[PDB]
């Protein structure tokens, strides 16, 4: 599963 944190922009995966 991929996601982008809406605060830092950090991504767990692309």
């Amino acid at each position, epitope marked *: *599963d*991929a*996601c*982008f*944190r*809406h*605060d*830092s*922009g950090y991504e767990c995966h*692309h």
Partner: antibody, heavy 116, light 108 residues
Framework: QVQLKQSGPGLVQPSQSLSITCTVSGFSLTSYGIHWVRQSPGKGLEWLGVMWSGGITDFYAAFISRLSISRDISKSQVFFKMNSLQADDTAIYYC??????????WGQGTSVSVSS | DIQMTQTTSSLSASLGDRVTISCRASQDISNYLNWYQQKPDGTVKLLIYYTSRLHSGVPSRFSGSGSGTDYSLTISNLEQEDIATYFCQQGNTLPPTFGGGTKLEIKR
């Protein structure tokens, strides 16, 4: 209380720059991202860019050359400048706060018109 | 880009109805989906995030469901102040994309 207050004029002359200051309170800009979204009439919500919490910015591809996003931490302000507006830019321009998952708190909007 | 598609633009409802607003993404977004509410006055509010989690302040008649491509915002026992446009938004891959929107309207 979490709040986002937009200042800056609605009216931009053609080929002139749209400037919107997004002033915030009751949260830290160090800890949250500020996203810049617009809503053309009838068309949907359009993401334009973001000042991430860390201080690095990102943009939608189609606006890369037109946008500037700076911030001032001590003032609690993030700043938005888009260049060379035409009529196809007529929209409500939103600054919105990003948390972990979503855009959880939104500016009142800025109704933008393009006319000479 | 992930395409977000709310296949109905206009939605005809009656006060007290259970309304379901529907949203399809171009790929699996693995439950990373937010629902927003835009009023006629232009104020925007987050309703729910990560498919089904209610934001602080949001009444309990607002629920979410879905996995993979297809997601739903359901408003049980619909009220007058719930008459607005509703937008889905994927949080899977940049850039953030939203659906076209579904505007609520009164059936007569």
């Amino acid at each position: 209380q979490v709040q986002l207050k937009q200042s800056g004029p609605g009216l931009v002359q053609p080929s002139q720059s749209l400037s919107i200051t997004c002033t915030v309170s009751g949260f830290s800009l160090t800890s949250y991202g500020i996203h810049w979204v617009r809503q053309s009439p009838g068309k949907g919500l359009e993401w334009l860019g973001v000042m991430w919490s860390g201080g690095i910015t990102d943009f939608y591809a189609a606006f890369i050359s037109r946008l500037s996003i700076s911030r001032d931490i001590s003032k609690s302000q993030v700043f938005f400048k888009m260049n060379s507006l035409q009529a196809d830019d007529t929209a409500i321009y939103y600054c919105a706060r990003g948390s972990r998952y979503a855009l959880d708190y939104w500016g009142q909007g800025t109704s933008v018109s393009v006319s000479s | 880009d992930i395409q977000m598609t709310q296949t109905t633009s206009s939605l005809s409802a009656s006060l007290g109805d259970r309304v379901t607003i529907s949203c399809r993404a171009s790929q699996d977004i693995s439950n990373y989906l937010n629902w927003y509410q835009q009023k006629p006055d232009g104020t925007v509010k987050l309703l729910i995030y990560y498919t089904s989690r209610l934001h602080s302040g949001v009444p309990s008649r607002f629920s979410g469901s879905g996995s993979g491509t297809d997601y739903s915002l359901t408003i049980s026992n619909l009220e007058q102040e719930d008459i607005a446009t509703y937008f889905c938004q994927q949080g899977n891959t940049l850039p953030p994309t939203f659906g076209g929107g579904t505007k609520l309207e009164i059936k007569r």
